[PDB]
A paper describes a structure:
Here, we report a comprehensive structural and functional analysis of the previously uncharacterized protein P116 (MPN_213). Single-particle cryo-electron microscopy of P116 reveals a homodimer presenting a previously unseen fold, forming a huge hydrophobic cavity, which is fully accessible to solvent. Lipidomics analysis shows that P116 specifically extracts lipids such as phosphatidylcholine, sphingomyelin and cholesterol. Each monomer consists of two distinct domains: the core domain (residues 246–867) and the amino-terminal domain (residues 60–245), situated distal to the dimer axis.
Numbering used by the authors:
A (entry chain A), B (entry chain B): 60 to 868
């Protein structure tokens, strides 16, 4: 048999850390930091009610696995003498005597965790002595599957076989104490990592080459340009399908996604290597896709890509769910096996999800993720509208609280997703209609009495972006931009006064038609393959070697100087990119009243009117009756100039195009971009330092910080092809021609904008981070991710700022 | 024979006074004042080298005229004993013994200046004793023909016939001392007169009656109205003759004076009684008069009127020349005798005139006043141009220094009379042409290089009167009032560039024609007898008795209250009083350029133009190219409204008349005056005090001071008959009609003027001075002008302010 056991119980619980200094409330520290406090924290578990059962269980595991597991075939083990002295003084010790009794008639040897060479004859009671004086158990760390601080104990000086074994480890890599940390991880956070990762002949310096730096720097610009071009063609290949769709035939956001699915793959195989099959599979995982693929097929195939994307999420706690992914995917050859194993594990997965408050609302989702084998991501998204909208609203609110600079975009996004039906895009709907009824339609999202005056999303975005930049013409926006059924459809008012559905009354299809026309033009006239082909990113030098200097904990670029010329060719923005937007404006012929209100019936002209009526006209004085004959023809000629048959569409056509709208050809180019602009990535003595993912990962890149990315936008010509007024029937023609004057003002302001907002020799500085990947997804900078010294913890908090394991002190 | 004479020489000289206190340098004091200083001043003559011959001459005159003139027929006079003791102590005395020896054999009596009853037989030496102790000779005054202080001496206590004769006068009324005063006159100046002239039963109170006061007060208003009406008809009877004269036929200022001569008489027989023949004779004393009358005929006939007018002149010294007028006119029955006596007296008159510096320049004038018997006043005036212009300039300069309030009228008068040829009006000339070439013609009165830019008299008067009241429209006056050949004929420029005498070039007859047309209209349409007949001065109460209260040195009106209603009827100021003045303005069709300069090319509009061009247009801001399309039609419509064929005459016709000038009838009434205004001469306890002429005169009036002369101008209606625009071809017609607006402005401003400048219930206070004359020029208030107590000296200086007969002390 084996030795007697008394308290072999081993179950226990983990611990957690407390905030210190003025650090964020979410503490996710790494190892070190509490270098001295680890012993003190382990002493608490060493001197509590859970201490001696854990110690006895560890002793039992040691005396079975390490003592008689290679034995007991010919040597029975007994423990006649065995005692412990774990006292209240937090000082532990032991004294064990082991007898090996052999019943076989032969000569054998004892295998013990030491260089022991002892010969024992048959029927002989071999002696074994394990002595431990009263001493403080030392603390060493272990790496849990979650990469958390699994505190373990070791003996300092204990005698085995009568000799002292210095630095004795009591079955390392696993202890029956379960004293983990919920907020402290094994490894080096962000900066203790940049002590053994860079240097003279250390990891980063010997794994990053000058030719590699040059090729990655060039490929950074090349891939940025390529993804920009693929994005531009994508909206321009899907936009063409959107626009060309016939009226009354629904075309969902995802049915068109298939028609450009490969492009997405290309796009996402250039943003991140290996992320090519995942997105092309994702946009095919819907009922509207031509070839449906299940969620399990989506997940098992590109498991590694999903792992990288999850590790790129900002939330640390996801890594806790990421520790079982490798165990989840072990021994699986097809998606059916993965589905079966997830069904097997559901009995433990779903209670953990339900018990977690953060994922408590998520509980239904994962539910059918284990209930139906034909799950589709986008079908789930369109079916679980409420929960997904809730998380999206929370995430967007957090982003607003974190990104005040893009507050308008987050505001319009939140207003969009305030409606559950906004998730009907990812389903069986009409995108060219859903985007119109979400972004260009009044909202009534309330139930108290009525808040239907909430207007549309585009109108609110214009109000935010034109807050106070323009004031007098704001009334114009009130009469032509804020009060048009093509941008503010006025929900629930169509069936209020007509109740007969006239052709003009139904503005839901006229606005959809205008949006389809705009999509047609942006698709096959502006962002077409032919029009986007004349934008060439040509290398200029691309020859200089990017020498690297290494000296102690540093890695610098000697002289980075690469320049790429983006030649815009002749990017003809044809008439129709802005002619369709003109057609979005109402075609109401009532131009006299609106212009009269804007010019004369205002807040400043009326004050001058009154002041000149009561008194004024300096030098004259006594001629006060002349005044209501002076500011009456001044208004009269201006009013009479306005053509009775011209709307704001025609006025804006005169202002922008010059010639009248009916006489302006849609094939002509409104704006032509010619020439080229330079990109001048440069720098001297630029530091190169490791760049990690959001969570703990074995894949690492490198970043060059302080790269002067000069975008010299000069040498480009943004020319208005129609720089002269060719109109024959101007809206405000006459001796007080204002449409021509407005057109000249527009041309001058366009030249000013292209001189200041456009080319200005932009100067930027940032960090070029490249996570370069090899051919078969064997990225050059991959760490051992095994020993607790290269396990980087990017989300951890650095001890340099100051963290202590105590309650606010 | 008579008594022996030793120093009968009597010739001597006068004296003069010296300034004292802070009195004006021209001292012309009256008697009294130097009440105590007269004795001291006479002592100087009593103790000088001229004393004893004067005393001896006085003694001789006394002993011939008063002693033996009624004797020597039977009583020879001898002076065996005779001595004087006029010592250096200024104490005079005498001792005389007279023997009367009769050679006739009869009994006679001696006639002496005393109650002496003595009987002397024949051949008897009658004795006479005249004793005088050493005593100071007292001083008494005498009245010279010039009414100056003729100091005379008297003896206090001397014994005649053995008895003392108290207050002995040594031949009064004449002394051989000739100690006159050049600055002190006998009598009471202005206020010592109002001590014996008013009182309880003294002169003014007993010579002024309540009915007399009432009738004179009523006649004051009646005569003021009558002279105003006669003046208005006079220019309107002479103006008609001026206007109706044919072109090229000269009509002098005096040839027309005859055609209205009687009116002048009427006028001047209402301004001052008896001044009716003088002015009617004066304006007939010229070569241009139909019936010439000599200066002697003009002077001898109305000698009394000339005396009153000369006594009304402000200069005191003229009275010295007035002392011989009565002696001049003694024993003369016709103008021939007066001419003969002036020729006789010329040998003394002309040296006195020449020796006097003030009349030294006058010497030629009086010269022919005694050289030709056919002298004419106006022929002399037009012949002695230089001297008369010199005195007129000096008098006008003095009036300017004395009357700053009417400085503009004196300035234009001085500018007029700066030319000698300005006196050609009173001769053989053309008034309708001379007044045009003097008042509406440029002046070049200088010889240095050129001052021809002096402009005309009317232009300078407008510049003075429109100094800074209007500024912006001043440029209009520069282009239409300051630069018109009808008001600024531009002398010496007509024969500069043309040299061919075109019809338009000769502006001397076109301007004369315009002036003649204006005279025609003011003569027979506005100031005609028919039009002036409808202005009636009606008494309202004229019944209340003006009771007078007398109490010591006072005379007050108990309650003066008279009111006269001047009913203006319908005084039709026809079209032509202002239509002719419109025709004076140039008829140049260039109205666009002048109005453009006045309105747009100014000093304030251009600044606003520039400010709005550089920046501005509040609320818009970025629209700066619109501005040179905004302030271009604002000007363009205003410029295009102005009719190309309309001049400033037409614009002013639209502004004033309404309807166009060609369609405005000259017989219509531009302004009609209707209703009536009240004159409310009133007051309680109003002082009545004597009022004298400028110089010493026996004719006196009385003045009521403090009369509240309320001219309640209310209840009159000055109506514009054309208060609505009836024009069919306005100068600035269109949608920016400004001629109609200008006309409405003119109508409103006319109503405002007639509400404030016109009727306002004017309140005035003054002194009603009446020099009432009886039927045969026997004015009621005439003083004895004989005794040295009623001889008023109005020009004298009152001793109350302080005057002493010493050099500045």
């Amino acid at each position: 048999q084996p030795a007697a056991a008394t308290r072999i119980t081993v179950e226990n619980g983990t611990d957690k850390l407390v905030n210190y200094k003025s650090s964020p409330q979410q503490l996710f520290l790494a190892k070190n930091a509490l270098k001295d406090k680890l012993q003190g924290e382990f002493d608490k578990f060493l001197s509590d009610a859970k201490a001696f059962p854990a110690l006895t269980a560890d002793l039992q595991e040691w005396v079975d696995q390490q003592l008689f597991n290679p034995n007991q075939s010919f040597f029975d083990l007994s423990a006649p003498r065995s005692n412990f002295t774990l006292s209240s003084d937090k000082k532990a010790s032991l004294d064990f005597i082991f007898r090996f009794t052999n019943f076989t008639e032969s000569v054998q040897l004892l295998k013990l965790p030491e260089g022991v060479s002892v010969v024992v004859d048959s029927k002989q009671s071999f002696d074994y002595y394990v002595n431990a004086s009263a001493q403080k158990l030392l603390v060493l760390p272990l790496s849990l599957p979650d990469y958390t601080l699994g505190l373990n104990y070791m003996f300092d000086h204990i005698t085995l076989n009568g000799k002292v074994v210095n630095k004795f480890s009591f079955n390392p890599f696993k202890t029956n104490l379960n004293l983990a940390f919920s907020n402290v991880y094994n490894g080096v956070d962000v900066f203790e990592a940049q002590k053994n990762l860079v240097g003279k002949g250390k990891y980063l310096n010997t794994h990053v080459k000058a030719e590699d730096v040059k090729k990655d720097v060039n490929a950074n610009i090349k891939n940025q340009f390529d993804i920009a071009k693929i994005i531009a063609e994508l909206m321009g290949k899907a936009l063409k399908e959107f626009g060309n769709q016939q009226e009354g035939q629904p075309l969902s956001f995802l049915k068109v996604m298939d028609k450009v699915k490969e492009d997405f793959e290309k796009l996402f195989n250039l943003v991140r290597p290996g992320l090519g099959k995942f997105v092309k599979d994702l946009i095919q995982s819907s009922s509207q896709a031509e070839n449906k693929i299940t969620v399990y097929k989506l997940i098992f195939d590109n498991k590694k890509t999903i792992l990288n994307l999850l590790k790129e999420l900002s939330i640390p706690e996801l890594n806790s769910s990421l520790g079982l992914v490798d165990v989840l995917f072990d021994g699986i050859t097809d998606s059916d096996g993965l589905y079966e194993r997830l069904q097997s594990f559901k009995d433990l997965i779903v209670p953990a999800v339900k018990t977690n408050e953060k994922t408590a609302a998520l509980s239904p989702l994962i539910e059918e993720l284990l209930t139906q084998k034909d799950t589709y991501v986008f079908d789930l998204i369109q079916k679980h509208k409420g929960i997904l909208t809730n998380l999206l609203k929370n995430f967007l609110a957090d982003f607003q609280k974190s990104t005040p600079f893009m507050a308008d975009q987050v505001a319009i996004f939140t207003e969009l997703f305030d409606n559950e039906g906004a998730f009907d895009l990812f389903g069986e709907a009409d995108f060219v209609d859903k985007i119109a009824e979400l972004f260009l339609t009044k909202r009534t999202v309330k139930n108290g009495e009525k808040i239907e005056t909430k207007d549309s999303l585009l109108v609110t975005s214009l109000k935010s972006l034109l807050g106070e930049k323009v004031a007098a013409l704001g009334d114009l926006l009130d009469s032509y931009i804020f009060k048009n059924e093509l941008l503010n459809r006025s929900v629930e008012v169509a069936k209020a006064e007509a109740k007969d559905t006239k052709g003009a009354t139904d503005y839901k299809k006229e606005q959809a038609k205008a949006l389809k026309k705009l999509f047609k033009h942006i698709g096959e006239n502006t962002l077409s393959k032919t029009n986007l082909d004349k934008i060439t990113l040509k290398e200029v030098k691309n020859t200089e070697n990017v020498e690297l200097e290494e000296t102690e904990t540093t890695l610098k670029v000697k002289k980075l100087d690469v320049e790429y010329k983006v030649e815009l060719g002749n990017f003809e923005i044809k008439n129709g990119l802005i002619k369709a937007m003109l057609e979005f404006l109402p075609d109401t012929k009532d131009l006299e009243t609106t212009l009269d209100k804007l010019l004369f019936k205002g807040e400043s002209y009326k004050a001058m009117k009154d002041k000149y009526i009561k008194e004024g006209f300096p030098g004259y004085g006594w001629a006060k009756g002349v005044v209501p004959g002076a500011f009456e023809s001044i208004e009269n000629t201006f009013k009479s100039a306005i053509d009775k048959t011209k709307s704001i569409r025609d006025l804006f056509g005169d202002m922008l195009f010059g010639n009248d709208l009916s006489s302006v050809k849609e094939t002509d180019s409104f704006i032509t971009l010619g020439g080229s602009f330079d990109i001048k990535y440069g720098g001297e003595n630029l530091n190169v330092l490791p760049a990690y993912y959001s969570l703990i990962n074995s894949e690492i890149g490198y970043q060059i910080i302080g790269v002067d990315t000069t975008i010299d936008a000069t040498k480009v010509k943004v020319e208005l092809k129609n720089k002269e007024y060719k109109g024959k029937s101007p809206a405000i023609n006459g001796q007080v021609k204002l449409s021509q004057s407005f057109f000249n003002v527009w041309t001058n302001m366009f030249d000013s904008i292209t001189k200041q907002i456009f080319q200005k020799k932009y100067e930027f500085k940032d960090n070029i981070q490249v996570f370069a990947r090899n051919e078969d997804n064997t990225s050059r900078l991959e760490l051992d991710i095994s020993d607790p010294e290269q396990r980087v913890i990017p989300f951890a908090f650095v001890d340099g700022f100051g963290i202590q394991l105590k309650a606010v002190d």
